[PDB]
Amino acid sequence: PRKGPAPKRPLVNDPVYGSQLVTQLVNKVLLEGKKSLAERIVYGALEQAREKTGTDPVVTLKRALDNVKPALEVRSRRVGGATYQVPVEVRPDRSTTLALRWLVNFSRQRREKTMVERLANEILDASNGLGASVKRREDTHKMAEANRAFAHYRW
Amino acid sequence: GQKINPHGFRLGITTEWKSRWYADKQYKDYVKEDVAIRKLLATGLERAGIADVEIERTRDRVRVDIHTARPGIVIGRRGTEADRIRADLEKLTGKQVQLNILEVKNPESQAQLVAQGVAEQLSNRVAFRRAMRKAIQSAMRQPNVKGIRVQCSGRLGGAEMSRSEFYREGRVPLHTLRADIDYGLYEAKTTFGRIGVKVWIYKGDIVG
Amino acid sequence: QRWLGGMLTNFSTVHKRLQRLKELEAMEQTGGFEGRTKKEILMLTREKNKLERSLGGIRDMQKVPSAVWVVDTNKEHIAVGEARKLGIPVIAILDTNCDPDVVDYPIPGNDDAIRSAALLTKVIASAVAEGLQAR
Amino acid sequence: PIQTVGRRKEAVVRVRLVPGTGQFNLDGRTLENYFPNKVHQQLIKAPLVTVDRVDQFDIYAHLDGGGPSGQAGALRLAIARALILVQPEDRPALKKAGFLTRDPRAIERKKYGLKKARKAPQYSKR
Amino acid sequence: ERPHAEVVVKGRNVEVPDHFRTYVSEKLSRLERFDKTIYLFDVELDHERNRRQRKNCQHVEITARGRGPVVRGEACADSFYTAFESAVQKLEGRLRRAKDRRK
Amino acid sequence: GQKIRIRLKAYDHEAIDASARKIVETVTRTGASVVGPVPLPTEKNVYCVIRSPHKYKDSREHFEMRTHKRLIDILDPTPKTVDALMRIDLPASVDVNIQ
RNA sequence: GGCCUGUGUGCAGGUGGUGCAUGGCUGUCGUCAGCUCGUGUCGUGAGAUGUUGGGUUAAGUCCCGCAACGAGCGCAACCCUUGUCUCAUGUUGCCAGCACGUUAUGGUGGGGACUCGUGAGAGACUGCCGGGGUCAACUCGGAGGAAGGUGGGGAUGACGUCAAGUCAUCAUGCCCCUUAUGUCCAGGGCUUCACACAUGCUACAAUGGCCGGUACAAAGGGCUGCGAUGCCGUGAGGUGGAGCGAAUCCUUUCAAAGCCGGUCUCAGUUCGGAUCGGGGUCUGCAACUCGACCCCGUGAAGUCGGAGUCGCUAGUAAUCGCAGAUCAGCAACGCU
C-alpha cells in the first residue's frame, strides 16, 4: 500500500447470539474451508460452557477477552548495529484479533482429546485467569516493561 | 520473439481467411492437399509473385483463386501453364479444377509483392538504399498507402555481423484493432547466406 | 499571449500549424463531434483555445514575412535573433535598458507605460494606414 | 403472475413469491431438509427480517446450478427483486443494505505458467 | 562446515585431466579460508569450439550460496588457468565486499 | 403433418446467418411451413501449444476452432419445395445435414 | 508410352560440425513506461535543447510556463469473456397455467410464461449534486445504478540488450562422409546408482480414519469410436450390443469434500502407506530387463520439522474431485 490502504470486510452478525466477534472466531479457527465444521464446533463448545456455568457463555467469553486482550505490544526496528524492540500501542481491532490468535494457537496443544473440549476449557481458564494465552500476554507486558526505555522514538 | 503476425492477431475480427470450407472428417486430407498445392505452385512458377492463394471446397469440386500482378508471364497465353497446373491438380487429386486466376490493382500496396520485388533486387546483385527507399516511395505515392515499415535482416555490405535497421514513414499502429494491416515476408536465395525481409503496410482504418 | 520559438526562421512548420488550424476549424464547421469521444472533443476545445491564443498572424500572412516590428524587446530578445539572422530592418520603441545599436531603425521611448505604448502603437497603426491609403 | 430470477456463480433459481404462509418449497422439500445450515437460513430470511414480513409470502422455486452458498445468495437476490416488484417503497432501505447487488465475484480463469490461478511454483534462485 | 563446501566439478564437453580437479578443489578451499558461510558451489567448465574464434575459447559460470545472498562470478579466457584464476578473483571481490557489508 | 430437420454447421456466424435467411426466403416462396433458425449452442474445440521450439514451455498460445450451429425445422414438405431447396448453392464455409 | 528388371550416369542422403555464418521462431529485463525523428536554434565539435521546472496521473496521462514548433512506435480505447437489462425468439433444452402415463422418470401431447441457449443493442462517461483545486488539470465526499471512478480478468510484448537459446521442428551459407559418419535388420539401453541437487504428491492424525444412508455443478470428449440395460465374477473386468457423428445416446436424470447415523479414544494406533511374497485381469505379435489395475498377505521410515527460504490481497489463498489432449496400453501425482 504505497498509495494507500483499503477497507475492511463487513463482518456479519451471528444468527443465534447477536455478536460479530463470534463469526470472527469461527473465521479464525477455520481450516481448509470447513466453515460449517467450525460453526458446529464453536456452538457445541459454547453450549458446553453454558452447562458448565449455568449462564450465557458470551459474558465469560468477553471477560476472558478482557483478561487476554492487551492494548500494548512490540514492534521491532534495526538501528545502529543492534536491532531494538519498541513498545507500540495497539488499536482494539488488532488487539481482539491477536488475542483470538493466541487463544486458538495455545488451545490446539492441549490434551482434552478433542478440539471442542480443548477450546472450551481454554476459554474458561482465561475467564478465570489461568490460560497460556494469559501467560503469553503477561510475557508481552513484561517485555514492554523491560523496553519502556525506547518510547521517545514515538513510532 | 516480440511481435506476432498482425494478420493472425486480427484474423477473426478485421482481416479474413485464405482457405475457406467446412469439414469434420476430411480435414487432415484437405490440409495435406493444400500444402502440396502451395508447394507445387511455388515450384511450378517462381518468376512471378504469388500474392495469395485462396479458394474452397464442396461435396465434389475444388476451386482456386490466386493473385499476381504479372499473370502475363505466368499463364499460358494459349494455355501451357494453366494446363500444366491442371495436370498437377489431376496428379494430386483435385479432379475438378476451377483454377480462376486473378491479378491485383496496386502491386505496390501489396506487402508480399513489395517484399518479393525488394528481395529480387537484392538477389540480383544490388545494394540496399536505392532498392529499399525506392520501394518505400513507390508505395507511399499511392492513395490508401497511409503508412509503411520495412525490417530487413542480413549481411549487407558490412561483413560478418547480422545487422538489421529499419525504414518507415506514415503510421504503423500495430496494437490497434480497428486498423487494417498487410504483412509481408520472404526467405530465399543469396550468395553469403539468407536474407530475410518483413514488411508492414497500413491502409486506413475500419469501422464495422 | 505568447511568442513562439522560431516563427520567422521555421515559418514552414508553423505554416503546417495553420493548416491543422484550418483542418480543425473545418471539423468544427462540419459539426462532427459525437463521431468521436466527448472527452476528445473537449480536448479539441483545449487545442483550439491554445492554438488561437498563440497564433493569429499566419492566418493572413502566407507570404514570406518581413522582420519589421518588435514586441517586448528585452524579455523576447529571442524574437530579434530570429529577425536579424535574416537581417531585415527591425523597429521597436526602445525597451530602454537594452543594447540600443543592434537594430537598424531604433526609436527611444518606454518599456512599461500603457499610455505611451498605446500612443505609439496608434502612431505606427497610422503610418501603416497612410501607406496603404496612398498605396 | 409473479416470476423472477437470481444468479450467483452458476446458481440460477426461479421464484414464485405467493402471498401465503412462510411455507418454503425447494423442489419438493423445505428449508431445513435442504440447506441444513443456519447461516444459509439467515441469508435467505434476512429480507423477511428487513421488511418484517416473515410468514407473509410463500415461495415455490427450483434448484438449479451452483452449490449451497451460490444457491442461497441467488435465492435471496431473487426474493429481494420480487419484493421490489410487489412494492418499490422498500427499495431505498434494501440497496442501503445491498440485498440487491448481483455478486460479481466469479471464478478466475486458471492461467498458464503456474499451478493454478496465482500460486506460482517455488521460485528457486538456483 | 569445513568439508561442507559442496564441491561440484563439471565440464560439458572438454578433455578434463583429473589434475584440473585438484586445481579447482584447491582454489575453492582457498576461499573456504575466509568465508565460513558456504553451502553450495555449482561450477562449470564450458567450451564453445567455434572456428576462427573471438579471442575467448573457454568459459565458466560459478554461483555460490551464502546465508541469503547468493554470489555469482562469470569469466572467460583461452584455457583453464586464466578461467579458474579470473573467476576466483571475481569471487574474491564479491566476498571481500560481502564480508565488508555483512556487519 | 410431416417434418424435415436441417442441421447447419459452419465456422462464421455471418455466413450461417446469411444462408439461413436465403434458405428461409426460398421456403417462404412456396408457402412451406418454417420454424426458423432455432439457436443451438456452440462447440469450442481447444488445442494448446507452445510457441517456440526446444524449450520455453512456460510461454504458450491457445487456439479455439468453434463451430456455430443452427436447426431449421421445416414442415409441410411439398416435394416441389423439396426440389427447390435441395439445389441451392451457398458459400462454402457451410455444410448441411438434410434429414 | 505406365511400370519396374538391371548398366552406369547426373546423383540421392546425412540427427556430421559451425546458432559466434544465418534466416525465422521464441524467452528475457518488462506489460516497466519510456524510445526516437524532421525542421529549428545553441555549441569549434562530441552533442545538447524539444524529453528540463511546478501540480496531477494506472502511467512521457494532462495542465501552467520558456528556443522550440510538431510528429511517429508507445501507454489508453476499438477485440473476446464475465457482470445487469430490452426485442425476437422454441429443439436435442425449459416446461408455469393445462391434460394424459404414474413407477424410473416432463414420461407424452401441449405454452414461450420464467430460465434458457445465440444473435442484434442501449447501458458508465468524473455523465450528474456538492466541497477543494492557476478554476486548469485533477482529486474528497453524494445520488442513482448491477457495476463508479484505468467494474474485474484475458489477449496484445515500444526501441533494444543479454554474441541468451534453437544448424535436431523447418530452411539455410561454408567445410567433412560416401562403400560409409549413410542405410535395412534382431537384441539391449536411454528406467544402471556408493551419492548430491531441484520441482511435487500422499503422510506424521480426532477439524481425524472406518462402515452405512441421503442432495445440488459446470465443463468438455465419442465411428470401424463411445458403450449401459440382464447377469457372472470380491473386483479389476467379463461375452452382449441397444443408442449415438451426438443440448437426443454413452457420458448415472453427470461427482466429491459436505449433512445425518454408529464405532474407534491420542496410539508408532482401525495412523500411515512404502517395501516385499503370492494369485489374477486387460492392451499389445510381444509385459524379464521395463507397463497399469485388482484381490490376499506383508505393514517399514515418518510424531509438523535448522540455519534460511517460496508463494498469495478476493471468490484470491488453502482443500476435495472431475475432465481433455499426446495415448493401442501406461509411469498422468505431471500439463492444460
mmCIF file with all atom_site columns, C-alpha atoms (C1' of nucleotides) in Angstrom, chain D residues 3-5 7-10 12 14 16 29 34 36-37 62 64-69 71 81 91 95 100-126, chain G residues 82-85 94-97 113-116 143-147 151-157 197-201 214-219 257-259 309-319 334-336:
data_model
loop_
_atom_site.group_PDB
_atom_site.id
_atom_site.type_symbol
_atom_site.label_atom_id
_atom_site.label_alt_id
_atom_site.label_comp_id
_atom_site.label_asym_id
_atom_site.label_entity_id
_atom_site.label_seq_id
_atom_site.pdbx_PDB_ins_code
_atom_site.Cartn_x
_atom_site.Cartn_y
_atom_site.Cartn_z
_atom_site.occupancy
_atom_site.B_iso_or_equiv
_atom_site.pdbx_formal_charge
_atom_site.auth_seq_id
_atom_site.auth_comp_id
_atom_site.auth_asym_id
_atom_site.auth_atom_id
_atom_site.pdbx_PDB_model_num
ATOM 1   C CA    . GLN D 1 3   ? -41.852 -14.788 -11.840 1.00 0.00 ? 3   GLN D CA    1
ATOM 2   C CA    . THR D 1 4   ? -38.302 -13.568 -11.285 1.00 0.00 ? 4   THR D CA    1
ATOM 3   C CA    . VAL D 1 5   ? -34.729 -14.733 -11.106 1.00 0.00 ? 5   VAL D CA    1
ATOM 4   C CA    . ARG D 1 7   ? -27.882 -15.699 -10.061 1.00 0.00 ? 7   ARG D CA    1
ATOM 5   C CA    . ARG D 1 8   ? -24.715 -16.293 -8.030  1.00 0.00 ? 8   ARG D CA    1
ATOM 6   C CA    . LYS D 1 9   ? -21.799 -18.142 -9.693  1.00 0.00 ? 9   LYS D CA    1
ATOM 7   C CA    . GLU D 1 10  ? -23.754 -20.617 -11.814 1.00 0.00 ? 10  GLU D CA    1
ATOM 8   C CA    . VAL D 1 12  ? -29.810 -19.947 -11.138 1.00 0.00 ? 12  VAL D CA    1
ATOM 9   C CA    . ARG D 1 14  ? -36.582 -19.064 -10.458 1.00 0.00 ? 14  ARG D CA    1
ATOM 10  C CA    . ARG D 1 16  ? -42.810 -17.735 -7.430  1.00 0.00 ? 16  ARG D CA    1
ATOM 11  C CA    . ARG D 1 29  ? -38.714 -30.147 0.307   1.00 0.00 ? 29  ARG D CA    1
ATOM 12  C CA    . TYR D 1 34  ? -32.496 -28.759 2.071   1.00 0.00 ? 34  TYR D CA    1
ATOM 13  C CA    . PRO D 1 36  ? -29.328 -27.826 6.967   1.00 0.00 ? 36  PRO D CA    1
ATOM 14  C CA    . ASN D 1 37  ? -27.184 -24.738 7.636   1.00 0.00 ? 37  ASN D CA    1
ATOM 15  C CA    . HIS D 1 62  ? -36.426 -24.751 -8.469  1.00 0.00 ? 62  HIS D CA    1
ATOM 16  C CA    . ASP D 1 64  ? -30.546 -25.303 -10.481 1.00 0.00 ? 64  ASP D CA    1
ATOM 17  C CA    . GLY D 1 65  ? -26.809 -24.983 -10.724 1.00 0.00 ? 65  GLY D CA    1
ATOM 18  C CA    . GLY D 1 66  ? -24.203 -23.813 -8.247  1.00 0.00 ? 66  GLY D CA    1
ATOM 19  C CA    . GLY D 1 67  ? -23.719 -25.173 -4.769  1.00 0.00 ? 67  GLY D CA    1
ATOM 20  C CA    . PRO D 1 68  ? -25.415 -24.361 -1.462  1.00 0.00 ? 68  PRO D CA    1
ATOM 21  C CA    . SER D 1 69  ? -23.882 -20.915 -0.951  1.00 0.00 ? 69  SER D CA    1
ATOM 22  C CA    . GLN D 1 71  ? -27.922 -21.089 -4.437  1.00 0.00 ? 71  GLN D CA    1
ATOM 23  C CA    . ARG D 1 81  ? -36.264 -8.419  -6.571  1.00 0.00 ? 81  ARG D CA    1
ATOM 24  C CA    . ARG D 1 91  ? -36.127 -0.412  -2.161  1.00 0.00 ? 91  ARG D CA    1
ATOM 25  C CA    . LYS D 1 95  ? -29.726 -1.115  -1.590  1.00 0.00 ? 95  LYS D CA    1
ATOM 26  C CA    . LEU D 1 100 ? -29.928 -6.327  -4.499  1.00 0.00 ? 100 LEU D CA    1
ATOM 27  C CA    . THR D 1 101 ? -26.412 -6.389  -5.953  1.00 0.00 ? 101 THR D CA    1
ATOM 28  C CA    . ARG D 1 102 ? -25.679 -9.396  -8.124  1.00 0.00 ? 102 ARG D CA    1
ATOM 29  C CA    . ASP D 1 103 ? -22.446 -10.541 -6.512  1.00 0.00 ? 103 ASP D CA    1
ATOM 30  C CA    . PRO D 1 104 ? -19.816 -10.049 -9.281  1.00 0.00 ? 104 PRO D CA    1
ATOM 31  C CA    . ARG D 1 105 ? -17.261 -12.281 -7.569  1.00 0.00 ? 105 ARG D CA    1
ATOM 32  C CA    . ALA D 1 106 ? -16.925 -15.112 -10.069 1.00 0.00 ? 106 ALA D CA    1
ATOM 33  C CA    . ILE D 1 107 ? -14.185 -17.623 -10.658 1.00 0.00 ? 107 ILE D CA    1
ATOM 34  C CA    . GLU D 1 108 ? -10.910 -16.646 -12.293 1.00 0.00 ? 108 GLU D CA    1
ATOM 35  C CA    . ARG D 1 109 ? -9.507  -18.409 -15.313 1.00 0.00 ? 109 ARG D CA    1
ATOM 36  C CA    . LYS D 1 110 ? -6.736  -20.800 -14.400 1.00 0.00 ? 110 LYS D CA    1
ATOM 37  C CA    . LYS D 1 111 ? -3.703  -19.378 -16.176 1.00 0.00 ? 111 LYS D CA    1
ATOM 38  C CA    . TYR D 1 112 ? -0.552  -20.926 -17.601 1.00 0.00 ? 112 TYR D CA    1
ATOM 39  C CA    . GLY D 1 113 ? 2.948   -20.799 -16.197 1.00 0.00 ? 113 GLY D CA    1
ATOM 40  C CA    . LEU D 1 114 ? 1.532   -21.669 -12.780 1.00 0.00 ? 114 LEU D CA    1
ATOM 41  C CA    . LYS D 1 115 ? -0.016  -24.432 -10.707 1.00 0.00 ? 115 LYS D CA    1
ATOM 42  C CA    . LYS D 1 116 ? -3.332  -22.575 -10.697 1.00 0.00 ? 116 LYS D CA    1
ATOM 43  C CA    . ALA D 1 117 ? -4.672  -19.002 -10.904 1.00 0.00 ? 117 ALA D CA    1
ATOM 44  C CA    . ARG D 1 118 ? -1.900  -17.261 -8.955  1.00 0.00 ? 118 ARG D CA    1
ATOM 45  C CA    . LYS D 1 119 ? 0.160   -19.776 -6.963  1.00 0.00 ? 119 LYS D CA    1
ATOM 46  C CA    . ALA D 1 120 ? 3.425   -19.934 -8.883  1.00 0.00 ? 120 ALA D CA    1
ATOM 47  C CA    . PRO D 1 121 ? 5.916   -22.777 -8.419  1.00 0.00 ? 121 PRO D CA    1
ATOM 48  C CA    . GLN D 1 122 ? 8.640   -22.492 -5.822  1.00 0.00 ? 122 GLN D CA    1
ATOM 49  C CA    . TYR D 1 123 ? 10.994  -19.905 -7.292  1.00 0.00 ? 123 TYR D CA    1
ATOM 50  C CA    . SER D 1 124 ? 14.459  -21.165 -6.500  1.00 0.00 ? 124 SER D CA    1
ATOM 51  C CA    . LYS D 1 125 ? 17.349  -18.898 -7.454  1.00 0.00 ? 125 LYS D CA    1
ATOM 52  C CA    . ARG D 1 126 ? 19.410  -21.980 -8.377  1.00 0.00 ? 126 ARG D CA    1
ATOM 53  C "C1'" . U   G 2 82  ? -17.608 -12.283 -17.302 1.00 0.00 ? 82  U   G "C1'" 1
ATOM 54  C "C1'" . G   G 2 83  ? -21.005 -8.779  -14.893 1.00 0.00 ? 83  G   G "C1'" 1
ATOM 55  C "C1'" . U   G 2 84  ? -27.295 -6.013  -15.488 1.00 0.00 ? 84  U   G "C1'" 1
ATOM 56  C "C1'" . C   G 2 85  ? -31.257 -5.216  -18.993 1.00 0.00 ? 85  C   G "C1'" 1
ATOM 57  C "C1'" . C   G 2 94  ? -37.463 -25.099 -20.093 1.00 0.00 ? 94  C   G "C1'" 1
ATOM 58  C "C1'" . C   G 2 95  ? -41.864 -26.867 -19.107 1.00 0.00 ? 95  C   G "C1'" 1
ATOM 59  C "C1'" . A   G 2 96  ? -45.616 -22.469 -15.011 1.00 0.00 ? 96  A   G "C1'" 1
ATOM 60  C "C1'" . G   G 2 97  ? -51.294 -22.453 -16.476 1.00 0.00 ? 97  G   G "C1'" 1
ATOM 61  C "C1'" . A   G 2 113 ? -44.642 -17.991 -19.141 1.00 0.00 ? 113 A   G "C1'" 1
ATOM 62  C "C1'" . C   G 2 114 ? -39.807 -17.892 -16.020 1.00 0.00 ? 114 C   G "C1'" 1
ATOM 63  C "C1'" . U   G 2 115 ? -34.928 -19.975 -17.186 1.00 0.00 ? 115 U   G "C1'" 1
ATOM 64  C "C1'" . C   G 2 116 ? -32.521 -20.825 -21.275 1.00 0.00 ? 116 C   G "C1'" 1
ATOM 65  C "C1'" . A   G 2 143 ? -27.433 10.360  -5.992  1.00 0.00 ? 143 A   G "C1'" 1
ATOM 66  C "C1'" . G   G 2 144 ? -28.899 6.703   -8.885  1.00 0.00 ? 144 G   G "C1'" 1
ATOM 67  C "C1'" . G   G 2 145 ? -27.215 2.218   -10.767 1.00 0.00 ? 145 G   G "C1'" 1
ATOM 68  C "C1'" . A   G 2 146 ? -25.931 -4.236  -11.447 1.00 0.00 ? 146 A   G "C1'" 1
ATOM 69  C "C1'" . A   G 2 147 ? -21.499 -2.460  -11.579 1.00 0.00 ? 147 A   G "C1'" 1
ATOM 70  C "C1'" . G   G 2 151 ? -16.010 -2.697  -12.841 1.00 0.00 ? 151 G   G "C1'" 1
ATOM 71  C "C1'" . G   G 2 152 ? -12.555 -7.433  -12.755 1.00 0.00 ? 152 G   G "C1'" 1
ATOM 72  C "C1'" . G   G 2 153 ? -9.879  -10.949 -15.787 1.00 0.00 ? 153 G   G "C1'" 1
ATOM 73  C "C1'" . G   G 2 154 ? -7.595  -12.283 -20.540 1.00 0.00 ? 154 G   G "C1'" 1
ATOM 74  C "C1'" . A   G 2 155 ? -5.156  -11.230 -25.423 1.00 0.00 ? 155 A   G "C1'" 1
ATOM 75  C "C1'" . U   G 2 156 ? -1.914  -7.602  -27.242 1.00 0.00 ? 156 U   G "C1'" 1
ATOM 76  C "C1'" . G   G 2 157 ? 5.257   -7.636  -25.573 1.00 0.00 ? 157 G   G "C1'" 1
ATOM 77  C "C1'" . C   G 2 197 ? 20.567  -31.093 -6.055  1.00 0.00 ? 197 C   G "C1'" 1
ATOM 78  C "C1'" . A   G 2 198 ? 15.529  -29.073 -7.761  1.00 0.00 ? 198 A   G "C1'" 1
ATOM 79  C "C1'" . U   G 2 199 ? 10.440  -29.482 -8.594  1.00 0.00 ? 199 U   G "C1'" 1
ATOM 80  C "C1'" . G   G 2 200 ? 5.737   -32.152 -6.464  1.00 0.00 ? 200 G   G "C1'" 1
ATOM 81  C "C1'" . C   G 2 201 ? 2.206   -35.994 -4.140  1.00 0.00 ? 201 C   G "C1'" 1
ATOM 82  C "C1'" . U   G 2 214 ? -29.430 -39.347 1.720   1.00 0.00 ? 214 U   G "C1'" 1
ATOM 83  C "C1'" . A   G 2 215 ? -28.713 -33.859 -2.143  1.00 0.00 ? 215 A   G "C1'" 1
ATOM 84  C "C1'" . C   G 2 216 ? -27.423 -29.967 -5.611  1.00 0.00 ? 216 C   G "C1'" 1
ATOM 85  C "C1'" . A   G 2 217 ? -22.301 -28.137 -10.540 1.00 0.00 ? 217 A   G "C1'" 1
ATOM 86  C "C1'" . A   G 2 218 ? -20.142 -26.546 -14.711 1.00 0.00 ? 218 A   G "C1'" 1
ATOM 87  C "C1'" . A   G 2 219 ? -17.270 -28.449 -18.400 1.00 0.00 ? 219 A   G "C1'" 1
ATOM 88  C "C1'" . A   G 2 257 ? -15.482 -32.534 0.107   1.00 0.00 ? 257 A   G "C1'" 1
ATOM 89  C "C1'" . G   G 2 258 ? -20.207 -31.881 2.685   1.00 0.00 ? 258 G   G "C1'" 1
ATOM 90  C "C1'" . C   G 2 259 ? -25.396 -33.397 6.043   1.00 0.00 ? 259 C   G "C1'" 1
ATOM 91  C "C1'" . U   G 2 309 ? 13.745  -19.784 2.214   1.00 0.00 ? 309 U   G "C1'" 1
ATOM 92  C "C1'" . C   G 2 310 ? 8.954   -19.817 -1.799  1.00 0.00 ? 310 C   G "C1'" 1
ATOM 93  C "C1'" . G   G 2 311 ? 4.151   -18.270 -2.785  1.00 0.00 ? 311 G   G "C1'" 1
ATOM 94  C "C1'" . C   G 2 312 ? -0.522  -15.222 -2.009  1.00 0.00 ? 312 C   G "C1'" 1
ATOM 95  C "C1'" . U   G 2 313 ? -4.670  -9.001  -1.274  1.00 0.00 ? 313 U   G "C1'" 1
ATOM 96  C "C1'" . A   G 2 314 ? -10.587 -11.656 -3.310  1.00 0.00 ? 314 A   G "C1'" 1
ATOM 97  C "C1'" . G   G 2 315 ? -14.268 -15.707 -4.643  1.00 0.00 ? 315 G   G "C1'" 1
ATOM 98  C "C1'" . U   G 2 316 ? -7.676  -14.761 -4.242  1.00 0.00 ? 316 U   G "C1'" 1
ATOM 99  C "C1'" . A   G 2 317 ? -5.142  -18.187 -0.810  1.00 0.00 ? 317 A   G "C1'" 1
ATOM 100 C "C1'" . A   G 2 318 ? -5.985  -23.460 1.473   1.00 0.00 ? 318 A   G "C1'" 1
ATOM 101 C "C1'" . U   G 2 319 ? -8.539  -28.044 0.408   1.00 0.00 ? 319 U   G "C1'" 1
ATOM 102 C "C1'" . G   G 2 334 ? 2.747   -34.348 -14.273 1.00 0.00 ? 334 G   G "C1'" 1
ATOM 103 C "C1'" . C   G 2 335 ? 0.281   -30.333 -18.249 1.00 0.00 ? 335 C   G "C1'" 1
ATOM 104 C "C1'" . U   G 2 336 ? -3.940  -27.543 -19.673 1.00 0.00 ? 336 U   G "C1'" 1
#
